[PDB]
Amino acid sequence: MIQPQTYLEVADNTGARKIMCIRVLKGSNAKYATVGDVIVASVKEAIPRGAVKEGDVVKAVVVRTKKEIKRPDGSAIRFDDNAAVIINNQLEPRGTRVFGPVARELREKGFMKIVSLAPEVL
Amino acid sequence: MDERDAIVEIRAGTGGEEAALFARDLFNMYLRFAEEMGFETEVLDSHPTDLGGFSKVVFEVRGPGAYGTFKYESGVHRVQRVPVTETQGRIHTSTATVAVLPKAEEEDFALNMDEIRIDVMRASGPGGDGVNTTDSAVRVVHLPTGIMVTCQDSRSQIKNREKALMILRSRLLEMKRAEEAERLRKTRLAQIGTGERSEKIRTYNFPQSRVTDHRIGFTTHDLEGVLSGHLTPILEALKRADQERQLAA
RNA sequence: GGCGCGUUAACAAAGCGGUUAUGUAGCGGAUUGCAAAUCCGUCUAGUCCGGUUCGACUCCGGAACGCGCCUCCA
RNA sequence: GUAAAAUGCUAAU
RNA sequence: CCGAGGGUAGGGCCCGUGACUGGGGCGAAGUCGUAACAAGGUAGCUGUACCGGAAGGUGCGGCUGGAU
RNA sequence: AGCGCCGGCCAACUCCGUGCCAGCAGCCGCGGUAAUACGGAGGGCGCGAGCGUUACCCGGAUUCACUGGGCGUAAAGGGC
RNA sequence: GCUAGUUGGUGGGGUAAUGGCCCACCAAGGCGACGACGGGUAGCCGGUCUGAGAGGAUGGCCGGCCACAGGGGCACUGAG
RNA sequence: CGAUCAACGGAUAAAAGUUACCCCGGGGAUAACAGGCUGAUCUCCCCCGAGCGUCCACAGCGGCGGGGAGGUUUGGCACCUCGAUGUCGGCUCGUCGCAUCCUGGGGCUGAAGAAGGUCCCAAGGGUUGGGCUGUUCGCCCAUUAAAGCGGCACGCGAGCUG
RNA sequence: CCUAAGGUAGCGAAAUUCCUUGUCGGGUAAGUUCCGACCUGCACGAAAAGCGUAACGACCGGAGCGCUGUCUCGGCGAGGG
RNA sequence: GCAGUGAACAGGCUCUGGCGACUGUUUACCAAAAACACAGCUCUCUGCGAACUCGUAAGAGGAGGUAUAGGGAGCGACGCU
RNA sequence: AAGUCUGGGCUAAGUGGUAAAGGAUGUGGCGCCGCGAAGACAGCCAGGAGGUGGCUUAGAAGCAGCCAUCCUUUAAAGAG
RNA sequence: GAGCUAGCCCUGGCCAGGGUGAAGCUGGGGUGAGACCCAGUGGAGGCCCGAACCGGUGGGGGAUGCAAACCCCUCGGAUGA
Ligand SMILES: [K+]
Ligand SMILES: [Mg+2]
Ligand SMILES: [Mg+2]
Ligand SMILES: [Mg+2]
Ligand SMILES: [Mg+2]
Ligand SMILES: [Mg+2]
Ligand SMILES: [Mg+2]
Ligand SMILES: [Mg+2]
Ligand SMILES: [Mg+2]
Ligand SMILES: [Mg+2]
Ligand SMILES: [Mg+2]
Ligand SMILES: [Mg+2]
Ligand SMILES: [Mg+2]
Ligand SMILES: [Mg+2]
Ligand SMILES: [Mg+2]
Ligand SMILES: [Mg+2]
Ligand SMILES: [Mg+2]
Ligand SMILES: [Mg+2]
Ligand SMILES: [Mg+2]
Ligand SMILES: [Mg+2]
Ligand SMILES: [Mg+2]
Ligand SMILES: [Mg+2]
Ligand SMILES: [Mg+2]
Ligand SMILES: [Mg+2]
Ligand SMILES: [Mg+2]
Ligand SMILES: [Mg+2]
Ligand SMILES: [Mg+2]
Ligand SMILES: [Mg+2]
Ligand SMILES: [Mg+2]
Ligand SMILES: [Mg+2]
Ligand SMILES: [Mg+2]
Ligand SMILES: [Mg+2]
Ligand SMILES: [Mg+2]
Ligand SMILES: [Mg+2]
Ligand SMILES: [Mg+2]
Ligand SMILES: [Mg+2]
Ligand SMILES: [Mg+2]
Ligand SMILES: [Mg+2]
Ligand SMILES: [Mg+2]
Ligand SMILES: [Mg+2]
Ligand SMILES: [Mg+2]
Ligand SMILES: [Mg+2]
Ligand SMILES: [Mg+2]
Ligand SMILES: [Mg+2]
Ligand SMILES: [Mg+2]
Ligand SMILES: [Mg+2]
Ligand SMILES: [Mg+2]
Ligand SMILES: [Mg+2]
Ligand SMILES: [Mg+2]
Ligand SMILES: [Mg+2]
Ligand SMILES: [Mg+2]
Ligand SMILES: [Mg+2]
Ligand SMILES: [Mg+2]
Ligand SMILES: [Mg+2]
Ligand SMILES: [Mg+2]
Ligand SMILES: [Mg+2]
Ligand SMILES: [Mg+2]
Ligand SMILES: [Mg+2]
Ligand SMILES: [Mg+2]
Ligand SMILES: [Mg+2]
Ligand SMILES: [Mg+2]
Ligand SMILES: [Mg+2]
Ligand SMILES: [Mg+2]
Ligand SMILES: [Mg+2]
Ligand SMILES: [Mg+2]
Ligand SMILES: [Mg+2]
Ligand SMILES: [Mg+2]
Ligand SMILES: [Mg+2]
Ligand SMILES: [Mg+2]
Ligand SMILES: [Mg+2]
Ligand SMILES: [Mg+2]
Ligand SMILES: [Mg+2]
Ligand SMILES: [Mg+2]
Ligand SMILES: [Mg+2]
Ligand SMILES: [Mg+2]
Ligand SMILES: [Mg+2]
Ligand SMILES: [Mg+2]
Ligand SMILES: [Mg+2]
Ligand SMILES: [Mg+2]
Ligand SMILES: [Mg+2]
Ligand SMILES: [Mg+2]
Ligand SMILES: [Mg+2]
Ligand SMILES: [Mg+2]
Ligand SMILES: [Mg+2]
Ligand SMILES: [Mg+2]
Ligand SMILES: [Mg+2]
Ligand SMILES: [Mg+2]
Ligand SMILES: [Mg+2]
Ligand SMILES: [Mg+2]
Ligand SMILES: [Mg+2]
Ligand SMILES: [Mg+2]
Ligand SMILES: [Mg+2]
Ligand SMILES: [Mg+2]
Ligand SMILES: [Mg+2]
Ligand SMILES: [Mg+2]
Ligand SMILES: [Mg+2]
Ligand SMILES: [Mg+2]
Ligand SMILES: [Mg+2]
Ligand SMILES: [Mg+2]
Ligand SMILES: [Mg+2]
Ligand SMILES: [Mg+2]
Ligand SMILES: [Mg+2]
Ligand SMILES: [Mg+2]
Ligand SMILES: [Mg+2]
Ligand SMILES: [Mg+2]
Ligand SMILES: [Mg+2]
Ligand SMILES: [Mg+2]
Ligand SMILES: [Mg+2]
Ligand SMILES: [Mg+2]
Ligand SMILES: [Mg+2]
Ligand SMILES: [Mg+2]
Ligand SMILES: [Mg+2]
Ligand SMILES: [Mg+2]
Ligand SMILES: [Mg+2]
Ligand SMILES: [Mg+2]
Ligand SMILES: [Mg+2]
Ligand SMILES: [Mg+2]
Ligand SMILES: [Mg+2]
Ligand SMILES: [Mg+2]
Ligand SMILES: [Mg+2]
Ligand SMILES: [Mg+2]
Ligand SMILES: [Mg+2]
Ligand SMILES: [Mg+2]
Ligand SMILES: [Mg+2]
Ligand SMILES: [Mg+2]
Ligand SMILES: [Mg+2]
Ligand SMILES: [Mg+2]
Ligand SMILES: [Mg+2]
Ligand SMILES: [Mg+2]
Ligand SMILES: [Mg+2]
Ligand SMILES: [Mg+2]
Ligand SMILES: [Mg+2]
Ligand SMILES: [Mg+2]
Ligand SMILES: [Mg+2]
Ligand SMILES: [Mg+2]
Ligand SMILES: [Mg+2]
Ligand SMILES: [Mg+2]
Ligand SMILES: [Mg+2]
Ligand SMILES: [Mg+2]
Ligand SMILES: [Mg+2]
Ligand SMILES: [Mg+2]
Ligand SMILES: [Mg+2]
Ligand SMILES: [Mg+2]
Ligand SMILES: [Mg+2]
Ligand SMILES: [Mg+2]
Ligand SMILES: [Mg+2]
Ligand SMILES: [Mg+2]
Ligand SMILES: [Mg+2]
Ligand SMILES: [Mg+2]
Ligand SMILES: [Mg+2]
Ligand SMILES: [Mg+2]
Ligand SMILES: [Mg+2]
Ligand SMILES: [Mg+2]
Ligand SMILES: [Mg+2]
Ligand SMILES: [Mg+2]
Ligand SMILES: [Mg+2]
Ligand SMILES: [Mg+2]
Ligand SMILES: [Mg+2]
Ligand SMILES: [Mg+2]
Ligand SMILES: [Mg+2]
Ligand SMILES: [Mg+2]
Ligand SMILES: [Mg+2]
Ligand SMILES: [Mg+2]
Ligand SMILES: [Mg+2]
Ligand SMILES: [Mg+2]
Ligand SMILES: [Mg+2]
Ligand SMILES: [Mg+2]
Ligand SMILES: [Mg+2]
Ligand SMILES: [Mg+2]
Ligand SMILES: [Mg+2]
Ligand SMILES: [Mg+2]
Ligand SMILES: [Mg+2]
Ligand SMILES: [Mg+2]
Ligand SMILES: [Mg+2]
Ligand SMILES: [Mg+2]
Ligand SMILES: [Mg+2]
Ligand SMILES: [Mg+2]
Ligand SMILES: [Mg+2]
Ligand SMILES: [Mg+2]
Ligand SMILES: [Mg+2]
Ligand SMILES: [Mg+2]
Ligand SMILES: [Mg+2]
Ligand SMILES: [Mg+2]
Ligand SMILES: [Mg+2]
Ligand SMILES: [Mg+2]
Ligand SMILES: [Mg+2]
Ligand SMILES: [Mg+2]
Ligand SMILES: [Mg+2]
Ligand SMILES: [Mg+2]
Ligand SMILES: [Mg+2]
Ligand SMILES: [Mg+2]
Ligand SMILES: [Mg+2]
Ligand SMILES: [Mg+2]
Ligand SMILES: [Mg+2]
Ligand SMILES: [Mg+2]
Ligand SMILES: [Mg+2]
Ligand SMILES: [Mg+2]
Ligand SMILES: [Mg+2]
Ligand SMILES: [Mg+2]
Ligand SMILES: [Mg+2]
Ligand SMILES: [Mg+2]
Ligand SMILES: [Mg+2]
Ligand SMILES: [Mg+2]
Ligand SMILES: [Mg+2]
Ligand SMILES: [Mg+2]
Ligand SMILES: [Mg+2]
Ligand SMILES: [Mg+2]
Ligand SMILES: [Mg+2]
Ligand SMILES: [Mg+2]
Ligand SMILES: [Mg+2]
Ligand SMILES: [Mg+2]
Ligand SMILES: [Mg+2]
Ligand SMILES: [Mg+2]
Ligand SMILES: [Mg+2]
Ligand SMILES: [Mg+2]
Ligand SMILES: [Mg+2]
Ligand SMILES: [Mg+2]
Ligand SMILES: [Mg+2]
Ligand SMILES: [Mg+2]
Ligand SMILES: [Mg+2]
Ligand SMILES: [Mg+2]
Ligand SMILES: [Mg+2]
Ligand SMILES: [Mg+2]
Ligand SMILES: [Mg+2]
Ligand SMILES: [Mg+2]
Ligand SMILES: [Mg+2]
Ligand SMILES: [Mg+2]
Ligand SMILES: [Mg+2]
Ligand SMILES: [Mg+2]
Ligand SMILES: [Mg+2]
Ligand SMILES: [Mg+2]
Ligand SMILES: [Mg+2]
Ligand SMILES: [Mg+2]
Ligand SMILES: [Mg+2]
Ligand SMILES: [Mg+2]
Ligand SMILES: [Mg+2]
Ligand SMILES: [Mg+2]
Ligand SMILES: [Mg+2]
Ligand SMILES: [Mg+2]
Ligand SMILES: [Mg+2]
Ligand SMILES: [Mg+2]
Ligand SMILES: [Mg+2]
Ligand SMILES: [Mg+2]
Ligand SMILES: [Mg+2]
Ligand SMILES: [Mg+2]
Ligand SMILES: [Mg+2]
Ligand SMILES: [Mg+2]
Ligand SMILES: [Mg+2]
Ligand SMILES: [Mg+2]
Ligand SMILES: [Mg+2]
Ligand SMILES: [Mg+2]
Ligand SMILES: [Mg+2]
Ligand SMILES: [Mg+2]
Ligand SMILES: [Mg+2]
């Protein structure tokens, strides 16, 4: 459950460390973003000389949420942080590595390169 | 262009008091050549030196074809002679610059109200129930440029709308005057440059009675005639090398 | 918008119902190696329109532009 | 000890 | 226990960069004056102080690298 | 068989072209209508499968001086 | 101006082996204008270049020594 | 005879201001809010067809003029209310109009397609979250099918805020 | 030309600037506010003092971190009514 | 043991502007402030039966003080002016 | 409350029962021309041409803008 | 009418506890003597935290009130004007 003002960790190597969701790119007025949804975000904290810098308005897909995700089989999954992978307008990740587990919901939503790059899919 | 009247801006170059004197030689040369063309001259701005020269002279040449003829004079003209200001008898090399501008339109500026949006709203500050309930404040927006003027100076929307449009027009005009002035500036610097001894367009060597126009190679020896107005040989020779430049592919 | 003031020559600026204002400049001369300073001379006028008057820069009315002040209780 | 009217001058062996 | 390192917080030094700002060097011409070099037309220079468009001026004290 | 060079330093010069232009330049300086200093040419000088240039080190620099310097007025005696 | 394992002691641990190398404790000492501490830079020498020498510059190949093996830490094995 | 007693039937021989520290008596005889009437201003729609649009008045436009509608704005008037009709914006809750922002249906196009332009029908539903400012308004950020415009005492303070 | 004489230093879109949300720079995804500048100061200015200033302030601005039912956006529970 | 000031009482912090130096004071009961006061600075009056204040006066205060003092005024630590 | 009273006519819009410029083969009634068996008007069927363009324009050459709009078999055919 | 409130006059009373640690003094160092440095002692202050006590900052409640100014939370002063 991500919304504008929500801070997200960056689970890639773009240089970005903290991004702040400013929009949920899901229709006219979606209240919340979950795993596999795209957001617009401000890059609030970055390491020096990365691809993106502080101030950049970027897109990302949310890979992990602290609000548990429910699944048709009756199970659920919950992460310790809210994390996102920064992407381009073609949904491809802009970094070359993905740090940490990602939700299997990303697969079924066409984020296969990200799923591939992720060290564990849960 | 070619057929409209022309403004000629003669400015002293490197040379100091002798550049200013030579500027007056260039000045009298053009006024005469205007007579021998049926052209009318009129001085708009003159800055005389107490020695007889001009640090700057600006005059118009009125008559059909002025910018057609005088246009070939815009540049730096070099003089080489023994100045009246020299006392050891040396030859000094001074410069004067000539700037040729087609005469301008004083075109009047008015607002196309169809490209102006007027917003009315409540003003701010004091007024009691008045300021609370009255659409006295006015914003006028020049839709093409986007610049806006606001007025709540009075209690009246009508007075405030008028003052807003006044200021808006006055600001657009100052923008339009500034563009044409930046355009004029670059044009001028293109013709005149720094006015250094290089950059020269034509030499006037009094020791040798030589007048060389290094743009085409035309040399004469009637330096007295040239300075008395008889410039027509150079122009035509420039004019013909012009058309020989317009031989294409 | 209201009220008051103003528009004079190259500029700045006055008086005046009949009349080279003035200062500086500009213009001719002098002086100076030359320029300045200085000296001898000299000179261009009343925003437009309409009235009064024998006669208007001058007076009255309007316009145009400029300046100054005010436009408050909502 | 007293003794000055008065400014300037570019840039080419 | 120590421990690569990661993290949190506060310091230090250095580099690059910054609206704007300070003066500086330079320039075959500009505007203003003429301070200095000749009792340079008020001898100059001086530390300091106050002042002035600008060089500078003036006060106090010093120096001669001052004139006849 | 080529490359550098021929104002002075520094060895090697005349002619045309150019006319403060085009250009040369390590320094001093050349070029503004008779340029050994620009460009070419002829002639010449120097090296040679090299010739020049750029960068950098020591030298020339007794110009950090120990060998081997200075401080009245050239930079330099500390106010005592 | 620097210094808390800091400088010394005692007792230990460890090592092939001395040592604060490590540890517990006792003492309050240790270093510095003969430049400690910090900052910059650098692998060092035989040698090499230059220089009249004294000096200066330099450490490429070759030899000697040290240091490092993607960036770090660590020990196992072992004569090492 | 002495009056610019010129406020010219002339209050004293003799006289200015300020009050948001204010007070009383009155007035909806008279302003400010809102309503009303009106509609110059405002908004919208037409008529004319000069001209633009390579060509071609009318795809899209419309010189000089002309005719209307509406009753959001700014005014005019002073008709209920001054023994009180609480006034901006926000919040909440809406409801209506349609001159329609979107979605649905259309004609024309200078409509190849896609995407637009323009006009017609259509009010069922919908019409986002932020930065600035008290703001309304407007600009900006990120989105959207779209980020409509107006009426309701510029809706709504015996509902809140201030 | 006029004046009694024409605002010096310092400061300045300010508790002051109408135009104004001036312009530039900073901060923000986006800043009519804020900070730093600029200076045609509508309408600063030197004891109704000018410009600074450590410390202090239930004063008034601006920003960040922390944390939160303020909010998205509301739910449940308690007791007095 | 989830948790040891295990309950109760007991600062959120930082950066940066404006104003006022500061602790104080105020519109009892809508304003606590940038307002008032404040040490301190300056101008001025006052030679003592002082000036000034209250009072018709007497008499008082000033002050059982005496110009390093007393009154009045503005400014408001301090710094540079 | 009193005529679904009488006679002639108009309107088809619920106009009546809310408005203008202006627009219209709405409807009825007048005029005043005109063309018609010299066979009209509408439809249909031919012809509707040629020298073929004249200025500007590589074609604008009957069918852009400019210039005037000659004439043949003819029953009539505009260089439109 | 100063039994409210404002100022002053006389005479009494009150201010838990904790924190900071000025001057001075002592000792040591330092010097020609000094200044001054250091440690200890000391206990200053319109100093700090915080009850009583004196206030009344922000918010909520109350609004025919418990109350014609109250209640709750929060907050300022608390050896001093
Ligand atoms: K009043
Ligand atoms: Mg980066
Ligand atoms: Mg940042
Ligand atoms: Mg940043
Ligand atoms: Mg990425
Ligand atoms: Mg991670
Ligand atoms: Mg001379
Ligand atoms: Mg409009
Ligand atoms: Mg208003
Ligand atoms: Mg405001
Ligand atoms: Mg008012
Ligand atoms: Mg109104
Ligand atoms: Mg006016
Ligand atoms: Mg006059
Ligand atoms: Mg004049
Ligand atoms: Mg006069
Ligand atoms: Mg007079
Ligand atoms: Mg005269
Ligand atoms: Mg004269
Ligand atoms: Mg003369
Ligand atoms: Mg006249
Ligand atoms: Mg007359
Ligand atoms: Mg007249
Ligand atoms: Mg006359
Ligand atoms: Mg006149
Ligand atoms: Mg007149
Ligand atoms: Mg006003
Ligand atoms: Mg008033
Ligand atoms: Mg003298
Ligand atoms: Mg003399
Ligand atoms: Mg003089
Ligand atoms: Mg001069
Ligand atoms: Mg000079
Ligand atoms: Mg560690
Ligand atoms: Mg560490
Ligand atoms: Mg820096
Ligand atoms: Mg001099
Ligand atoms: Mg002098
Ligand atoms: Mg002289
Ligand atoms: Mg002199
Ligand atoms: Mg002198
Ligand atoms: Mg002096
Ligand atoms: Mg003086
Ligand atoms: Mg000297
Ligand atoms: Mg050579
Ligand atoms: Mg030789
Ligand atoms: Mg010959
Ligand atoms: Mg050469
Ligand atoms: Mg050389
Ligand atoms: Mg030459
Ligand atoms: Mg020649
Ligand atoms: Mg020569
Ligand atoms: Mg030659
Ligand atoms: Mg040369
Ligand atoms: Mg040479
Ligand atoms: Mg040569
Ligand atoms: Mg060989
Ligand atoms: Mg050397
Ligand atoms: Mg040496
Ligand atoms: Mg020696
Ligand atoms: Mg020497
Ligand atoms: Mg000495
Ligand atoms: Mg000395
Ligand atoms: Mg000294
Ligand atoms: Mg130990
Ligand atoms: Mg050790
Ligand atoms: Mg010990
Ligand atoms: Mg190091
Ligand atoms: Mg290093
Ligand atoms: Mg040597
Ligand atoms: Mg070495
Ligand atoms: Mg290593
Ligand atoms: Mg490697
Ligand atoms: Mg490794
Ligand atoms: Mg390693
Ligand atoms: Mg009167
Ligand atoms: Mg009267
Ligand atoms: Mg009267
Ligand atoms: Mg009468
Ligand atoms: Mg009377
Ligand atoms: Mg009398
Ligand atoms: Mg009176
Ligand atoms: Mg009164
Ligand atoms: Mg008041
Ligand atoms: Mg007031
Ligand atoms: Mg009162
Ligand atoms: Mg009263
Ligand atoms: Mg009263
Ligand atoms: Mg009253
Ligand atoms: Mg009353
Ligand atoms: Mg009454
Ligand atoms: Mg009346
Ligand atoms: Mg009435
Ligand atoms: Mg009224
Ligand atoms: Mg009115
Ligand atoms: Mg009203
Ligand atoms: Mg009213
Ligand atoms: Mg009104
Ligand atoms: Mg109302
Ligand atoms: Mg009204
Ligand atoms: Mg009403
Ligand atoms: Mg109307
Ligand atoms: Mg109407
Ligand atoms: Mg109207
Ligand atoms: Mg219409
Ligand atoms: Mg056309
Ligand atoms: Mg068409
Ligand atoms: Mg029109
Ligand atoms: Mg009309
Ligand atoms: Mg109408
Ligand atoms: Mg209405
Ligand atoms: Mg109506
Ligand atoms: Mg209305
Ligand atoms: Mg109205
Ligand atoms: Mg009425
Ligand atoms: Mg009436
Ligand atoms: Mg009323
Ligand atoms: Mg009643
Ligand atoms: Mg009533
Ligand atoms: Mg009532
Ligand atoms: Mg509505
Ligand atoms: Mg419709
Ligand atoms: Mg549209
Ligand atoms: Mg549609
Ligand atoms: Mg559609
Ligand atoms: Mg289509
Ligand atoms: Mg298309
Ligand atoms: Mg369509
Ligand atoms: Mg249509
Ligand atoms: Mg609808
Ligand atoms: Mg914010
Ligand atoms: Mg907002
Ligand atoms: Mg807003
Ligand atoms: Mg606004
Ligand atoms: Mg759409
Ligand atoms: Mg759209
Ligand atoms: Mg919005
Ligand atoms: Mg309302
Ligand atoms: Mg509304
Ligand atoms: Mg309301
Ligand atoms: Mg209320
Ligand atoms: Mg309200
Ligand atoms: Mg109500
Ligand atoms: Mg009510
Ligand atoms: Mg109600
Ligand atoms: Mg009511
Ligand atoms: Mg308020
Ligand atoms: Mg309030
Ligand atoms: Mg002023
Ligand atoms: Mg002055
Ligand atoms: Mg001064
Ligand atoms: Mg100043
Ligand atoms: Mg400013
Ligand atoms: Mg601003
Ligand atoms: Mg300020
Ligand atoms: Mg102001
Ligand atoms: Mg402003
Ligand atoms: Mg404003
Ligand atoms: Mg803005
Ligand atoms: Mg910015
Ligand atoms: Mg930041
Ligand atoms: Mg900005
Ligand atoms: Mg705000
Ligand atoms: Mg600022
Ligand atoms: Mg400005
Ligand atoms: Mg002031
Ligand atoms: Mg005053
Ligand atoms: Mg004031
Ligand atoms: Mg004053
Ligand atoms: Mg200040
Ligand atoms: Mg200070
Ligand atoms: Mg301060
Ligand atoms: Mg401070
Ligand atoms: Mg305070
Ligand atoms: Mg206080
Ligand atoms: Mg306070
Ligand atoms: Mg904040
Ligand atoms: Mg924050
Ligand atoms: Mg926060
Ligand atoms: Mg709640
Ligand atoms: Mg409940
Ligand atoms: Mg209950
Ligand atoms: Mg346990
Ligand atoms: Mg506390
Ligand atoms: Mg603050
Ligand atoms: Mg400031
Ligand atoms: Mg401010
Ligand atoms: Mg205070
Ligand atoms: Mg205060
Ligand atoms: Mg202050
Ligand atoms: Mg202060
Ligand atoms: Mg103070
Ligand atoms: Mg102050
Ligand atoms: Mg206190
Ligand atoms: Mg305190
Ligand atoms: Mg009160
Ligand atoms: Mg009160
Ligand atoms: Mg009361
Ligand atoms: Mg209160
Ligand atoms: Mg207050
Ligand atoms: Mg209060
Ligand atoms: Mg307070
Ligand atoms: Mg007060
Ligand atoms: Mg104070
Ligand atoms: Mg003071
Ligand atoms: Mg004093
Ligand atoms: Mg006194
Ligand atoms: Mg009395
Ligand atoms: Mg008395
Ligand atoms: Mg007595
Ligand atoms: Mg006594
Ligand atoms: Mg006193
Ligand atoms: Mg005070
Ligand atoms: Mg004060
Ligand atoms: Mg003050
Ligand atoms: Mg019947
Ligand atoms: Mg009958
Ligand atoms: Mg109908
Ligand atoms: Mg009907
Ligand atoms: Mg009808
Ligand atoms: Mg009492
Ligand atoms: Mg009592
Ligand atoms: Mg007592
Ligand atoms: Mg106490
Ligand atoms: Mg105690
Ligand atoms: Mg205590
Ligand atoms: Mg204590
Ligand atoms: Mg403590
Ligand atoms: Mg102690
Ligand atoms: Mg003692
Ligand atoms: Mg002692
Ligand atoms: Mg002590
Ligand atoms: Mg104590
Ligand atoms: Mg103690
Ligand atoms: Mg205290
Ligand atoms: Mg305290
Ligand atoms: Mg404490
Ligand atoms: Mg009180
Ligand atoms: Mg309270
Ligand atoms: Mg109380
Ligand atoms: Mg609270
Ligand atoms: Mg309350
Ligand atoms: Mg309440
Ligand atoms: Mg009450
Ligand atoms: Mg009651
Ligand atoms: Mg209470
Ligand atoms: Mg209590
Ligand atoms: Mg409490
Ligand atoms: Mg407390
Ligand atoms: Mg307390
Ligand atoms: Mg406290
Ligand atoms: Mg306390
Ligand atoms: Mg206490
Ligand atoms: Mg006491």
From Swiss-Prot, chain A:
Q: Note the coiled coil stretches, chain numbering.
A: none
| Keyword Coiled coil appears in the UniProt entry | no
The record's Gene Ontology biological-process terms are:
translation
Keyword set, alphabetical order = Ribonucleoprotein, Ribosomal protein, RNA-binding, rRNA-binding
Any one GO MF term held by the record is: large ribosomal subunit rRNA binding
User: What domain of life is recorded for the organism?
Assistant: Bacteria
Task: Report the GO terms under cellular component.
Answer: cytosolic large ribosomal subunit
InterPro entries registered for this protein in UniProt: Ribosomal_uL14 (IPR000218), Ribosomal_uL14_bac-type (IPR005745), Ribosomal_uL14_CS (IPR019972), Ribosomal_uL14_sf (IPR036853)
Family the UniProt entry places it in: Belongs to the universal ribosomal protein uL14 family.
**Assembly description:** Part of the 50S ribosomal subunit. Contacts protein L19. Forms a bridge to the 30S subunit in the 70S ribosome, contacting the 16S rRNA.
- HAMAP family in the cross-refs: Ribosomal_uL14 (MF_01367)
Main role? This protein binds directly to 23S ribosomal RNA.
Record protein name field: Large ribosomal subunit protein uL14
Curated annotation (Swiss-Prot), chain B:
What keywords tag this UniProt record? Answer: Cytoplasm, Methylation, Protein biosynthesis
Query: Does the entry feature the keyword Plastid, yes or no?
Result: no
MF terms in GO: translation release factor activity, codon specific
* Top-rank taxon: Bacteria
Any one annotated GO CC term: cytoplasm
PTM annotation, UniProt: Methylated by PrmC. Methylation increases the termination efficiency of RF1.
Where is it localised? Cytoplasm
S-S pairs: none
| Keyword Protein biosynthesis included in the entry's annotation | yes
Predominant subcellular localization, coarse grouping:
cytoplasm
Q: N5-methylglutamine: which positions carry it?
A: D129
Describe the task this protein carries out.
Peptide chain release factor 1 directs the termination of translation in response to the peptide chain termination codons UAG and UAA.
Family membership: Belongs to the prokaryotic/mitochondrial release factor family.
Describe, as the record does, how this protein assembles with itself and its partners: Interacts with the ribosome.
Name the chain's protein.
Answer: Peptide chain release factor 1
Give the organism the record lists.
Answer: Thermus thermophilus (strain ATCC 27634 / DSM 579 / HB8)
